[PDB]
């Protein structure tokens, strides 16, 4: 006898009937939802490869509230009543790239790409609580976002341009 | 919100809805164990490969997330992230007074280059308080600054300022069983009270040797001779220690070389490490402590001078 | 014609919208199983057992494979000095006995870790000094030596001599590796999908360790989210693996390695320890040089002698030295076997250079530029391993850092700061770099392409090169319609895989674009001439007019393309014969602050000129500088890994090992690529830009250092041409520990000391 | 490949006729080599692209002169090899031509010649050659049922 | 030379064993669906509606 | 509350605790067991590619019984208590192949192969019954069995081989 998880991702509702408490929201995108966008880089939340939005009706502020997390350490047991958003709820080269997809490639702050949605989760993030950002709350918003390829002055430069 | 119930493979997961429930759970299974951000927990399932059967989220509980502004200082309930703590303080300092806002920007201070956006989002006050992590960065601000610590269990609440006794033992604090922490008063900082937070920009072993400071001073009234004078350290040992020793010492003496020269032989002594002590970098901590307090005296001497 | 335009990674959209698929981005087959390496926690010890009684008993645990399940070989590795997995002894502590095999990931880790192994320690080496002390070596020594040292230490004014370490790295590619195995059912057949740089070798290991002819075995390389030579060989340790797995269940398989296991189990980058010996004039113009270089090699050969052999070449940076010997042994040591890392032992060579450099200024109380600049090679001069530098651009580069820098106006800033200011010190310095380009190894230096059109003028390229970020295949691409006379659009590069370009060398020593560029060039070129005679009837005719009629005229529109790398083949023996094709060349002026009671540090500026020829692609190319000069910066500054007394990592994740950050990067970051050089040696007259830019990381160690001593001079003596040695990573530790002042002495306390 | 396996592609398809059998039999002839060293695994459009279908009886005829070429093409490189160890196996003059920067494979083609006919004018090859047999059948039928036996 | 012999089809063996892969016997992916064709019943129509 | 459906293949227990009435062998072979070998050329009766062996233990002749059968027709839902034998339940090239899957190799009896299959277990149910068979019993086993390539000529020829 066990209660229903419902939560929803990139809009869609998800109802799993059997949530599973050791189940991480990265293990459930990839292996269950099969949106592999959200990736593995290290499952100990250094380094933001596995970056997502959540947004949920904070019963307080009033206020729907949007944050990012890291999906490899969000237990989905967490999610009951939450909304997930990933790298392919922005936008895709299928339809239209968001703003943010559409900068960062054009920019060259992409080289392998690996820790490129994630990044693109922490500026949409960002966006969703400020849509006229600051240059330092541009690079604040990145802390927890590891890049290898870029020595990151490109992806800082490609987004100075959604501030002020 | 009804209280939810899931069920693993090894797991399982309670979802309070109500502080009764939890402190009913808790004393139904006080080996139980909380999880708000999970990032701490998943890091000792996954990588030490701790089981825990039972787990409670006390996340959806009003109370345990409440803001509340008192006369004494800012109290955030338990549940609270450290994203939420950071924008009420930073509102906090930009609003009030220098002289009621030292401990708050010590905190700040803490939590500047703490993880990233995503880990400030999820991670609670309280998590990092109990998981008593020898290297937490906010523990020893808060045992220097004597935050008031509110504290339940089905049937009790005790209210204690932190103190060096709050840690026994390694990753252990003075709580009860069935206890949970509630809540956490950070206080406005007084007249002729001022503070530091430092920290260490080099963490190489999992939970040791990261050298991590709160300090407080409280002089007598429009003075420069120490009424209080508080130095606590992460990274020295394994838990968050307070210099009292060497401290006592300096009750009603002047804020002056002789202080420093004092102050500096005390920490050397009372917080000299092994040759062999967990985590090496042994004279570097030494030294860290040292010049971490000569800061804090410069300071001072600052917002005095 | 995009050939010299800053034309975006071909990729980098899909990359960003999550789109572009990697290795465990593949969807799973209905009955996919998943492997978890199985791995030895001690040093040196003989295992007495294994019991699998508690994994058996994990929901999904389908097996456990061990030495024995291996049909054809557990013999492996670049020299055949490893297993596939351990037998009787472990020799380190990441070291591969084993491997789960269950229907979820999450089941392979529970039941891996419940694998009881029994062992019984043996004697260890772990240090440098461990292995000296008992001669504990793969092979014997190396060496270059030109001119007479006893006899330049004998015309000196001043000799310096000392000892020097260098940490190793970790690579950190943002993904780890992984293997997808199916096996076909027919004949031995296997495919395998693979964030690989060398297919070739991952197709030829499987094939050995099964015991099936190379033919059967397809390795299929899509992209890798990072490699930095990490995935030129190790790659094998998973692959072998999960192809076993799939060999003995008949169900596919895969494996993509957690963080942890990666940076315990595959390797990085060598640890050196140097000692040296200069000899310098009062002038300081350098006399003699006599240096012997240690490598860490850990517990397998690899790539360690070709990583010593390009250490021993670099070991000149770019200076002028009449007398010189440098030697270089290969440690034998109990550690996960280290393998090649962007710059392969030439970082390593290339700042114990810079550090006996930096002393010599120091020694003769002149100023540091005017000691390197002095000691320059000039255009058309010879190095110690006797090739000529021509088209040597160093001064140029110099020259235009120096004035674009503004050098002489900061180092008086600099000076000015200093004074004014007690507990905080800055340091500025502008360091060159050459690197030589082409392979050590002469057979490796060779590439293939094919090509078709299709019947629509659609032109798919196929080269022996892997994409890992470096934007390859957009350079494939750029060339490819350049030489074919197309758009861009009209082409299409798809992967790397084993069935199309066989016997490829790994994507390695910064040369494919050289070599795949000129093989998929002379694919073109054999195109166009089959295309010529429909041309000639149809000067008007559009490309897809052309195409259509060589088909229906039965003319092939399908080729291979080659090339070689001419006039290569250095001799140890001897000392002579071409070991590069050229040399890449750059020079960085970096600024930093200190906090000299904390150890902490900012990166104030850095400006970067690098000669790449004429750029295929100036925004992939300044991309790589900047890449590769912030991977130095991690390496000399912040990388740092730690092991326990007997052997043990402890640094296994990015909360305890630090890579660069957002935040750690130079305040003001300028890259410029030196105009008006064409390099007749390579594509479109471009350069090699991969590994090159990476020691100029160096510049900001350099400028640390100088931050420094003038620490020192404040605080510690009153002696300007005091040595002191700084290691690298030069970590907040290490520098804070050099500060000496009334807090490292104890005080003020009012004990005595010093200082 | 470096242990001497080879792998052939061709633009035929193998649907029961033996095709693979038979360019298997012409590559070893052709390289002089045992079939067992030589394998096929399929054909595809990244392997050998614009192909015929396999159909009009020719796959063996075609894919048999593509496959001959390209073994032909390997031969000439491998001859310098073979000349300086005459001795040595298979196996020696691959690895030895590897190690020298020879490339190991090639690409062949095969254009079959004097074929166009045309249907004005009623001349020129429609074909390259014409296959020829004959059959005797013998039969027994049922007057009474319409039944019959292949005798 | 085995040129002129009667050499067995190479993948006979494998027929007889059921182990030759045709194309349906290739494994399904985990999220593998199948298509079924929706086929005129008329030999020449116009068409009007389809639900 | 409905009840477990118990059979073997190739030795193996199959226990099917929701078995559907309509859920043919051929398909539950294919689609359940992954065992490819069986092969569908027509979901009616008529060309034998999905020729299985069934074995059941007779009450009243003692006697285990053995038959060929259609899979594509056979109900898994007749087949409790019944053991199933496919041409991979009888010899593989990974171990060694059965006489019958040898000689019809070697006889030039297997083209595209896709018949084989079937063919293979007709005989071997042959086979299974008469060790000696005659020559007229070995070609009435092949009634239901169609194939296209070979002309059936080198079938029977390599299979003759198994009277005298
Ligand atoms: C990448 C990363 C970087 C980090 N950097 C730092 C850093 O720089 N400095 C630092 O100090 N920390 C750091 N942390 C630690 C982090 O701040 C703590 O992990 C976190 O605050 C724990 O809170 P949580 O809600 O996630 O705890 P959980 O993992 O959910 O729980 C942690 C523990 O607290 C208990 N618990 C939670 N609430 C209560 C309660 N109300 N009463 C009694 N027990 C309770 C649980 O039982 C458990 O034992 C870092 C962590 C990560 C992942
Ligand atoms: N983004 C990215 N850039 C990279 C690497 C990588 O793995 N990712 N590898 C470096 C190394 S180690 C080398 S030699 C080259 C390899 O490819 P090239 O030969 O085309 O330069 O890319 C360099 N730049
Ligand atoms: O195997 C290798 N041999 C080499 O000589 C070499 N040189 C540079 C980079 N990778 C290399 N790899
Ligand atoms: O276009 C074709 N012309 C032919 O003669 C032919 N012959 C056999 C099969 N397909 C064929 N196709
Ligand atoms: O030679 Mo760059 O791949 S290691
Ligand atoms: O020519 Mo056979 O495909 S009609
Ligand atoms: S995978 Fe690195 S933070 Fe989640
Ligand atoms: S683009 Fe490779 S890690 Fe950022
Ligand atoms: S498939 Fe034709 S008889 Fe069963
Ligand atoms: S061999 Fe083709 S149907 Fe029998
Ligand atoms: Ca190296």
Redesign the interface.
Same mark, same amino acid.
């Given at each position: 006898?066990?209660?229903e998880?419902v939560f929803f991702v990139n809009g869609k509702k998800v109802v799993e009937k059997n949530?599973?408490?050791?189940? $991480?929201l990265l293990?459930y995108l990839?292996?269950k939802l099969?949106?592999?966008?959200?990736?593995?880089?290290?499952?100990?939340?250094?380094?933001?490869?596995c $970056?997502v939005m959540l947004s949920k009706y904070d019963?307080?502020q009033d206020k729907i509230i949007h944050?990012?997390?890291?999906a490899?350490?969000?237990?989905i047991? $967490?999610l009951?009543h939450v909304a997930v958003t $990933?790298?392919?709820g922005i936008?895709?080269?299928?339809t239209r790239?968001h703003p943010?997809?559409?900068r960062?490639?054009?920019s060259?702050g992409?080289?392998?790409?690996?820790?490129?949605?994630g990044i693109?989760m922490?500026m949409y993030?960002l966006l969703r609580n400020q849509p006229e950002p600051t240059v330092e709350e541009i690079?604040?918003?990145?802390?927890?976002?590891?890049?290898?390829?870029?020595?990151?002055?490109?992806?800082?430069q490609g987004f100075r341009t959604f501030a002020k | 919100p009804k209280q939810?119930?899931?069920?693993?493979?090894?797991?399982?997961?309670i979802?309070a809805s109500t502080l009764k429930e939890l402190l009913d759970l808790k004393a139904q299974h006080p080996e139980a164990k909380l999880?708000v951000?999970?990032?701490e927990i998943?890091?000792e399932? !996954?990588?030490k490969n701790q089981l825990f059967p039972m787990?409670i989220?006390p996340?959806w509980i009003?109370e345990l997330?409440?803001v509340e502004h008192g006369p004494e200082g800012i109290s955030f309930g338990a549940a609270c992230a450290l994203?939420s703590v950071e924008k009420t303080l930073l509102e906090a300092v930009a609003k009030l007074p220098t002289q009621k806002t030292e401990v708050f920007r010590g905190v700040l201070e803490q939590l500047r280059?703490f993880?990233? !956006?995503?880990?400030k989002?999820?991670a609670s006050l309280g998590g990092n308080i109990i998981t008593a992590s020898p290297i937490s960065d906010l523990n020893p601000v808060f045992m220097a600054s004597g935050t008031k610590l509110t504290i339940v269990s089905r049937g009790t609440r005790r209210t204690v300022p932190m103190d060096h006794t709050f840690f026994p033992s390694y990753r252990k604090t003075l709580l009860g069983p069935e206890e949970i922490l509630l809540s956490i008063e950070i206080p406005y900082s007084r007249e002729d009270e001022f503070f530091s937070a430092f920290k260490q920009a080099s963490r190489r072993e999992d939970d040791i040797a990261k050298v991590t400071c709160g300090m407080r001073v409280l002089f007598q009234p429009g003075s420069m001779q120490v009424k209080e004078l508080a130095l606590c350290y992460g990274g020295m040992a394994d838990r968050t220690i307070s210099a009292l020793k060497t401290t006592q010492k300096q009750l009603s003496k002047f804020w002056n070389e002789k202080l420093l020269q004092d102050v500096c032989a005390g920490l050397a002594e009372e917080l000299s490490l092994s040759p062999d002590a967990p985590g090496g970098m042994i004279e570097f901590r030494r030294t860290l402590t040292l010049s971490f307090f000569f800061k804090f005296y410069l300071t001072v001497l600052k917002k005095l001078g | 014609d995009t050939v010299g335009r %800053?034309l975006?990674?071909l990729?980098?959209?899909?990359?960003?919208?999550?789109?572009?698929?990697?290795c /465990? /981005?593949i969807?799973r087959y209905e009955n996919e199983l998943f492997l978890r390496l199985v791995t030895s926690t001690r040093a040196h010890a003989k295992i007495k057992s294994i019991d699998v009684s508690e994994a058996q008993k994990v929901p999904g645990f389908v097996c456990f494979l061990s030495a024995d399940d291996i049909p054809g070989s557990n013999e492996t590795g670049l020299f055949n000095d490893e297993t596939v997995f351990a037998k009787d002894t472990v020799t380190c502590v990441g070291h591969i006995i084993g491997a789960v095999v269950a229907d979820?990931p999450?089941h392979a880790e529970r039941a891996a870790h419940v694998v009881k192994v029994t062992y019984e320690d043996l004697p260890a080496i772990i240090t440098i000094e461990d292995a000296i002390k008992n001669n504990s070596f793969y092979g014997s020594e190396l060496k270059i030596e030109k001119g007479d040292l006893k006899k330049g230490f004998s015309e000196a004014d001043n000799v310096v001599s000392g000892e020097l370490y260098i940490g190793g790295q970790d690579?950190?590619?943002?993904?780890?590796h992984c293997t997808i195995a199916i096996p076909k059912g027919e004949e031995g057949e296997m495919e395998l999908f693979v964030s690989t740089q060398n297919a070739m070798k991952t197709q030829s290991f499987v094939a050995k360790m099964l015991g099936v002819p190379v033919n059967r075995i397809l390795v299929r390389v899509k992209?890798?989210?990072?490699g930095?030579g990490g995935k030129e060989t190790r790659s094998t340790l998973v692959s072998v693996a999960v192809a076993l797995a799939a060999y003995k269940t008949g169900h596919p398989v895969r494996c993509?390695l /957690?963080?942890?296991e990666d940076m315990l189990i595959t390797g990085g980058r060598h640890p050196f320890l140097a000692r040296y010996k200069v000899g310098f004039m009062k002038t300081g113009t350098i006399v003699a040089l006599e240096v012997d270089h240690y490598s860490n090699a850990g517990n397998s050969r690899d790539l360690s002698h070709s990583i010593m052999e390009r250490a021993l070449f670099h070991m000149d940076n770019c200076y002028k030295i009449p007398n010189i010997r440098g030697t270089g042994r290969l440690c034998k040591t109990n550690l996960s076997s280290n393998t090649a890392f962007r710059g392969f032992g030439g970082p390593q060579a290339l700042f114990i250079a810079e550090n006996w450099m930096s002393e010599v200024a120091v020694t003769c109380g002149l100023p540091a530029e005017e000691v390197r600049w002095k000691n320059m090679y000039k255009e058309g001069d010879l190095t110690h391993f006797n090739q000529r530098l021509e088209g040597f651009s160093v001064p140029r580069c110099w020259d235009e850092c120096l004035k674009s820098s503004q050098y002489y106006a900061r180092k008086s800033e600099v000076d000015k700061f200093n004074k004014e200011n007690c507990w905080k010190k800055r340091g500025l310095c502008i360091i060159p770099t050459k690197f030589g380009i082409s392979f050590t190894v002469p057979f490796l230096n060779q590439a293939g392409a094919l090509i078709h059109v299709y019947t629509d003028g659609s032109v798919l390229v196929s080269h022996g090169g892997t994409e890992?970020?470096?934007?390859l295949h957009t350079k494939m691409v750029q060339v490819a319609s350049k030489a074919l006379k197309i758009p861009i659009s009209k082409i299409y590069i798809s992967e790397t895989s084993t069935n199309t370009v066989p016997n490829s060398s790994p994507t390695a020593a910064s040369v494919s674009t050289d070599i795949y560029g000129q093989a998929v060039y002379e694919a073109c070129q054999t195109i166009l001439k089959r295309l010529e005679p429909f041309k000639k009837k149809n000067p008007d005719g559009s490309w897809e007019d052309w195409v259509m009629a060589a088909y229906q005229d039965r003319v092939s529109l399908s080729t291979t393309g080659f090339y070689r790398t001419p006039n290569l083949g250095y001799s140890f023996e001897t000392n002579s014969g071409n070991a590069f094709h050229y040399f890449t060349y750059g020079v960085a002026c970096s600024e930093v602050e200190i906090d000299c009671l904390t150890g902490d540090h900012k990166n104030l500026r850095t400006d970067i000129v690098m000669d790449v020829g004429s750029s295929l692609n100036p925004?992939?190319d300044?991309?790589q500088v900047?890449?590769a000069?912030?991977?130095g910066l991690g390496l000399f500054t912040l990388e740092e890994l730690h092991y326990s007394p007997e052997g043990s990592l402890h640094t296994r994740?990015?909360?305890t090992y630090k890579? %660069?950050?957002?935040?750690?990067?130079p305040t003001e970051?300028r890259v410029s690529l030196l105009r008006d050089c064409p390099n007749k040696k390579a594509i479109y007259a471009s350069k090699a830009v991969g590994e090159p830019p990476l020691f100029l990381g160096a510049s900001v160690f350099f400028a640390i250092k100088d931050a420094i001593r003038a620490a020192r001079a404040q605080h510690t003596n009153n002696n300007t041409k005091e040595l002191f040695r700084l290691d690298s990573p030069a970590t907040p530790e290490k520098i804070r520990n050099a500060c000496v002042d009334k807090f490292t002495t104890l005080c003020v306390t009012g004990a005595p000391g010093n200082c």
């Amino acid at each position: 006898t066990a209660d229903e998880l419902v939560f929803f991702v990139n809009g869609k509702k998800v109802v799993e009937k059997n949530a599973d408490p050791e189940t $991480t929201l990265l293990a459930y995108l990839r292996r269950k939802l099969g949106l592999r966008g959200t990736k593995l880089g290290c499952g100990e939340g250094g380094c933001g490869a596995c $970056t997502v939005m959540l947004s949920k009706y904070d019963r307080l502020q009033d206020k729907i509230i949007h944050f990012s997390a890291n999906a490899c350490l969000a237990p989905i047991c $967490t999610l009951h009543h939450v909304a997930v958003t $990933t790298v392919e709820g922005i936008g895709s080269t299928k339809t239209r790239l968001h703003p943010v997809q559409e900068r960062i490639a054009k920019s060259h702050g992409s080289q392998c790409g690996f820790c490129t949605p994630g990044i693109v989760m922490s500026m949409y993030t960002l966006l969703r609580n400020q849509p006229e950002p600051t240059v330092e709350e541009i690079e604040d918003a990145f802390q927890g976002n590891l890049c290898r390829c870029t020595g990151y002055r490109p992806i800082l430069q490609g987004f100075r341009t959604f501030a002020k | 919100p009804k209280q939810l119930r899931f069920e693993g493979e090894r797991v399982t997961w309670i979802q309070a809805s109500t502080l009764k429930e939890l402190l009913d759970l808790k004393a139904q299974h006080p080996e139980a164990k909380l999880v708000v951000g999970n990032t701490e927990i998943g890091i000792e399932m !996954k990588f030490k490969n701790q089981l825990f059967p039972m787990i409670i989220c006390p996340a959806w509980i009003p109370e345990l997330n409440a803001v509340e502004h008192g006369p004494e200082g800012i109290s955030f309930g338990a549940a609270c992230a450290l994203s939420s703590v950071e924008k009420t303080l930073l509102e906090a300092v930009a609003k009030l007074p220098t002289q009621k806002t030292e401990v708050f920007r010590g905190v700040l201070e803490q939590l500047r280059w703490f993880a990233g !956006k995503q880990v400030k989002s999820v991670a609670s006050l309280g998590g990092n308080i109990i998981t008593a992590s020898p290297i937490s960065d906010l523990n020893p601000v808060f045992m220097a600054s004597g935050t008031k610590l509110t504290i339940v269990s089905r049937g009790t609440r005790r209210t204690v300022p932190m103190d060096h006794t709050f840690f026994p033992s390694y990753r252990k604090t003075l709580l009860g069983p069935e206890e949970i922490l509630l809540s956490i008063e950070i206080p406005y900082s007084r007249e002729d009270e001022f503070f530091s937070a430092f920290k260490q920009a080099s963490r190489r072993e999992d939970d040791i040797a990261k050298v991590t400071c709160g300090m407080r001073v409280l002089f007598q009234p429009g003075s420069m001779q120490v009424k209080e004078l508080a130095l606590c350290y992460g990274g020295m040992a394994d838990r968050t220690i307070s210099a009292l020793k060497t401290t006592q010492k300096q009750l009603s003496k002047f804020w002056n070389e002789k202080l420093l020269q004092d102050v500096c032989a005390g920490l050397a002594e009372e917080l000299s490490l092994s040759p062999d002590a967990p985590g090496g970098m042994i004279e570097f901590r030494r030294t860290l402590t040292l010049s971490f307090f000569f800061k804090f005296y410069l300071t001072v001497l600052k917002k005095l001078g | 014609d995009t050939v010299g335009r %800053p034309l975006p990674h071909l990729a980098a959209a899909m990359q960003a919208s999550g789109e572009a698929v990697y290795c /465990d /981005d593949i969807p799973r087959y209905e009955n996919e199983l998943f492997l978890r390496l199985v791995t030895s926690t001690r040093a040196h010890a003989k295992i007495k057992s294994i019991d699998v009684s508690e994994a058996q008993k994990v929901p999904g645990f389908v097996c456990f494979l061990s030495a024995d399940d291996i049909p054809g070989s557990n013999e492996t590795g670049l020299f055949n000095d490893e297993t596939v997995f351990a037998k009787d002894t472990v020799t380190c502590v990441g070291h591969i006995i084993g491997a789960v095999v269950a229907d979820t990931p999450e089941h392979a880790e529970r039941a891996a870790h419940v694998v009881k192994v029994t062992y019984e320690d043996l004697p260890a080496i772990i240090t440098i000094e461990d292995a000296i002390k008992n001669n504990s070596f793969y092979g014997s020594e190396l060496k270059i030596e030109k001119g007479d040292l006893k006899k330049g230490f004998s015309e000196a004014d001043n000799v310096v001599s000392g000892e020097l370490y260098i940490g190793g790295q970790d690579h950190f590619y943002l993904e780890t590796h992984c293997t997808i195995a199916i096996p076909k059912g027919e004949e031995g057949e296997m495919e395998l999908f693979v964030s690989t740089q060398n297919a070739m070798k991952t197709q030829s290991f499987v094939a050995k360790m099964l015991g099936v002819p190379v033919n059967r075995i397809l390795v299929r390389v899509k992209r890798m989210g990072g490699g930095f030579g990490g995935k030129e060989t190790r790659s094998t340790l998973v692959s072998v693996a999960v192809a076993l797995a799939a060999y003995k269940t008949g169900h596919p398989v895969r494996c993509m390695l /957690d963080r942890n296991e990666d940076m315990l189990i595959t390797g990085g980058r060598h640890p050196f320890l140097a000692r040296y010996k200069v000899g310098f004039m009062k002038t300081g113009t350098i006399v003699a040089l006599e240096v012997d270089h240690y490598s860490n090699a850990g517990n397998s050969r690899d790539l360690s002698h070709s990583i010593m052999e390009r250490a021993l070449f670099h070991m000149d940076n770019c200076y002028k030295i009449p007398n010189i010997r440098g030697t270089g042994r290969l440690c034998k040591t109990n550690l996960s076997s280290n393998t090649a890392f962007r710059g392969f032992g030439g970082p390593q060579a290339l700042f114990i250079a810079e550090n006996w450099m930096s002393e010599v200024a120091v020694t003769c109380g002149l100023p540091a530029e005017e000691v390197r600049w002095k000691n320059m090679y000039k255009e058309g001069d010879l190095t110690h391993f006797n090739q000529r530098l021509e088209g040597f651009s160093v001064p140029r580069c110099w020259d235009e850092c120096l004035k674009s820098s503004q050098y002489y106006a900061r180092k008086s800033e600099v000076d000015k700061f200093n004074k004014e200011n007690c507990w905080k010190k800055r340091g500025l310095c502008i360091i060159p770099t050459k690197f030589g380009i082409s392979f050590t190894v002469p057979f490796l230096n060779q590439a293939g392409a094919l090509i078709h059109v299709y019947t629509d003028g659609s032109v798919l390229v196929s080269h022996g090169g892997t994409e890992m970020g470096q934007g390859l295949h957009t350079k494939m691409v750029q060339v490819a319609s350049k030489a074919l006379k197309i758009p861009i659009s009209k082409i299409y590069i798809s992967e790397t895989s084993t069935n199309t370009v066989p016997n490829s060398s790994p994507t390695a020593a910064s040369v494919s674009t050289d070599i795949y560029g000129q093989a998929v060039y002379e694919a073109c070129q054999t195109i166009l001439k089959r295309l010529e005679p429909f041309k000639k009837k149809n000067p008007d005719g559009s490309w897809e007019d052309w195409v259509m009629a060589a088909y229906q005229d039965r003319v092939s529109l399908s080729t291979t393309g080659f090339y070689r790398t001419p006039n290569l083949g250095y001799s140890f023996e001897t000392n002579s014969g071409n070991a590069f094709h050229y040399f890449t060349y750059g020079v960085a002026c970096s600024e930093v602050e200190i906090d000299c009671l904390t150890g902490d540090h900012k990166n104030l500026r850095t400006d970067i000129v690098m000669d790449v020829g004429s750029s295929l692609n100036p925004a992939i190319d300044i991309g790589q500088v900047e890449g590769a000069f912030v991977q130095g910066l991690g390496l000399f500054t912040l990388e740092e890994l730690h092991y326990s007394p007997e052997g043990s990592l402890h640094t296994r994740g990015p909360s305890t090992y630090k890579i %660069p950050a957002f935040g750690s990067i130079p305040t003001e970051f300028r890259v410029s690529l030196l105009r008006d050089c064409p390099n007749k040696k390579a594509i479109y007259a471009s350069k090699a830009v991969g590994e090159p830019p990476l020691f100029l990381g160096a510049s900001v160690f350099f400028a640390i250092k100088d931050a420094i001593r003038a620490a020192r001079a404040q605080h510690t003596n009153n002696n300007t041409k005091e040595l002191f040695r700084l290691d690298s990573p030069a970590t907040p530790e290490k520098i804070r520990n050099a500060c000496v002042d009334k807090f490292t002495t104890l005080c003020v306390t009012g004990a005595p000391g010093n200082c």
